[PDB]
Design a protein around this ligand. Sequence first.
Ligand SMILES: C[C@@H]1CN(C(=O)c2ccco2)CCN1C(=O)NCC(F)(F)F
Length: 120
Amino acid sequence: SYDIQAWKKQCEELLNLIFQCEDSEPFRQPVDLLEYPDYRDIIDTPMDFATVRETLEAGNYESPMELCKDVRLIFSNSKAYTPSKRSRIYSMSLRLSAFFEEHISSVLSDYKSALRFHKR
Ligand SMILES: C[C@@H]1CN(C(=O)c2ccco2)CCN1C(=O)NCC(F)(F)F
């Protein structure tokens, strides 16, 4: 399965599944500082799923590794901000992360295999 471009539609589909998850609600838009006025004190690089989707559709990811780095930043920012490991939003981030990692594994493997086949 050596299609070097297949990752992009696979990532669009996975983002659609993440938008249908109730666990994505808090991560679907850039954090509102009005509600969280200290957020940029703690979080140097905000990230959210709408920004990831727009960056993909603009053609501003070269590889699924770059998309994966931005999605992992959504989850690390939620760990950096949580006052507790028990909190609602942090618990939603951990379930959504497990879902994402389960689904991105094959996208990354197929892409890297396709690249190796191209360079053979
Ligand atoms: C505060 C929330 C959740 N959150 C956290 O990581 C977190 C962990 C513990 C407390 O907050 C950051 C993202 N947040 C937003 O408002 N984002 C805008 C939205 F929701 F419209 F997409």
